[PDB]
């Protein structure tokens, strides 16, 4: 949502084909979230290719089958600002 | 056939006892019943009742034990060959046979499964029963409410017979059947006494070894049995009961291997069901990929089965009565066969 | 020996069993029940119950198979005689006769109909029964909440009778009738015992083959039956039960 708002602010479209998720706790800290397999397969199904996830779920992202994780560049992050750099290169 | 007195009615029982290795406990009871039957008249309702109850005692195996398989790979093969994946259970049962093989004598444990309906939670049971070599038995409990069904009656009533479990334990002569309680989630409640409140007495891992059914009051050890339970959501079960039995989470399938199961079992299943041939009813893998990623997205497997059989059966009618001598599904044909796409490439904004 | 011997009652059961081919499994149970039944004193209620039970058990057809018509032109004729349009159901049942004819032996199946009320969903069932030549037999469950009706009782209760489905198999005297469970959409769903959790043991195609109800414990085999079900709208049907059954839409 914050990235959405920011895109409205600058008016820059968000970078094409860049999904993202995770929770944020009022100071840019990212937080873990469950259910990773469903989001993984869905993002793969939609063709989006720059998913960014909380660092805390790193382990859980790597427990998935290699073929499922083929072709999409995870960028783990802990403080929200890095995502702000990424959405707006 | 005039041997209807104490000469043969008590002989056949006492000799039938011989080969079993009965616990010394119940032999006393059986002896008083024999002598009391000896003093009883051959014709009276008391006589037939006592004789009937004695027959129910003598029928029960005491220490007969079905021989169990112990080879692993021969077990693992047959456990594997008729289902894909569901790795957890195929790993768990294998560990179980390992522990049983290590410490000599046979053993039993109680466990449960849970996942979205239709994942195959119930099909696997019978395959397991053919692997371990335990005799199979099932009895759906869902929607039952009569506790007496699983505990019998007092034997002084008219039609009292022991609860269902003793029927199971006589029907399979071994003392260690693979009982399979089913659909525990949907037991009745709240209009009479909950059968669940009785179930605890069975399922205590240790205490069950002196189970005491109301009909035949003598305690019946049955610790060696291997219970199983199957609920699709592990919340409705009341907590005190839910604690006893370890859970094992089956998980919904991913498409890439939902393909490879359907391409090995389901397709041959449906083709054998409809009686067609690979010549008459060829289907490419690619149409299966399309069908999977278009018309059916879900964790279950019932849905893909329904689509596959529908496609085949439309081809079958097109053959036996229609015009083509060999239907040949191609993606272009698919709309004709299945109907119309349901899911599409939803992307509100590609830019 | 005249004067109504008890062996006459035995034998009328036996003769009733001699023709129809029972599975070997239940072939024994009747034997021990008979041998016990003779020894009973006749005035005992136990004798009444056991004899009534044995009668109930011999009554079930075992492998009686009503023969099926299969010529397709006849199917078209008897369908178009009494229902216009609604071609979907027509084509589906025609595909049924096709696949059944490719594999010899008679087969069962589950289906579901749904659409606006009063389109004739009930009448077409009877027309289909006259088309395939199976017997017909309706059975409503709108609002039902006594689950025991579908599965009888322990046989020691007074007032116990085997659940309905055994009564209908006794009535149609045929292994493969065409049940018409009706108005599943309105089926009772309360604290009193939800039938919807007991129907699943019937409707699941794979495991129904050894269905058993508590009165006469021995499993029955429903695999050749062709269920049909009706509903004004899908949404209220409880989900697991909805999942089993194919869904035509008139
Ligand atoms: N891995 C699998 N291998 C083979 N068959 C499968 C598999 N998974 C599901 N099935 C098919 O699903 C059908 C029924 O599966 P099953 O009934 O075990 O699912 P379920 O979760 O038990 O649903 P429910 O408990 O409601 O019946 C079977 O016909 C079976 O072939
Ligand atoms: N196209 C049609 N062909 C034949 N009969 C029809 C048609 N449309 C309506 N009917 C009549 O509508 C009536 C509705 O009966 P019923 O099947 O009980 O409706 P529903 O089952 O939908 O409540 C039937 O008696 C039937 O003859
Ligand atoms: Mg099941």
XYZ file of C-alpha atoms and ligand atoms in Angstrom, chain B residues 82-86 115-124 182-183 186 230 232 250 253 261 265-266 269 300-302 305, chain C residues 200 204-207 240 244, ligand 1:
68
model
C -0.373 -46.622 -6.442
C -0.086 -43.006 -5.258
C 2.204 -40.125 -6.045
C 3.918 -38.058 -3.413
C 2.067 -37.622 -0.154
C -6.008 -31.773 4.760
C -8.400 -30.436 2.149
C -11.086 -32.972 1.239
C -10.389 -35.316 -1.626
C -6.598 -35.342 -1.411
C -6.591 -39.156 -1.140
C -6.597 -39.407 2.638
C -8.778 -42.502 2.555
C -7.513 -44.321 -0.508
C -4.084 -44.821 0.997
C -13.350 -42.406 9.492
C -14.465 -38.762 9.356
C -18.531 -34.871 11.635
C -9.242 -38.823 9.161
C -10.228 -32.614 7.046
C -1.245 -33.906 4.100
C -0.684 -30.808 -4.774
C 0.096 -38.361 -11.222
C -2.812 -43.360 -12.771
C -5.891 -41.215 -13.505
C -7.965 -45.375 -14.666
C -8.021 -31.556 -4.634
C -7.904 -34.135 -7.378
C -11.598 -34.945 -7.837
C -10.744 -36.559 -12.649
C -21.205 -38.951 2.118
C -18.529 -41.177 -2.481
C -18.146 -43.272 -5.678
C -15.231 -45.323 -4.513
C -16.070 -46.376 -0.979
C -17.904 -31.690 0.680
C -18.569 -35.540 -5.156
N -2.091 -39.406 -4.527
C -3.125 -40.075 -5.055
N -2.953 -41.215 -5.743
C -3.990 -41.877 -6.265
N -5.251 -41.443 -6.148
C -5.566 -40.302 -5.491
C -4.485 -39.548 -4.886
N -5.039 -38.488 -4.297
C -6.376 -38.554 -4.479
N -6.687 -39.646 -5.183
C -8.050 -40.029 -5.576
O -9.048 -39.444 -4.747
C -10.158 -40.340 -4.625
C -10.688 -40.291 -3.210
O -9.606 -39.839 -2.438
P -9.870 -39.659 -0.894
O -11.306 -39.991 -0.659
O -8.777 -40.412 -0.191
O -9.706 -38.106 -0.706
P -10.103 -37.671 0.758
O -9.344 -36.471 1.231
O -10.172 -38.967 1.516
O -11.586 -37.135 0.652
P -12.641 -37.662 1.725
O -11.987 -37.933 3.051
O -13.648 -36.557 1.790
O -13.074 -38.872 0.972
C -9.635 -41.713 -4.977
O -10.395 -42.232 -6.066
C -8.211 -41.511 -5.364
O -7.812 -42.203 -6.544
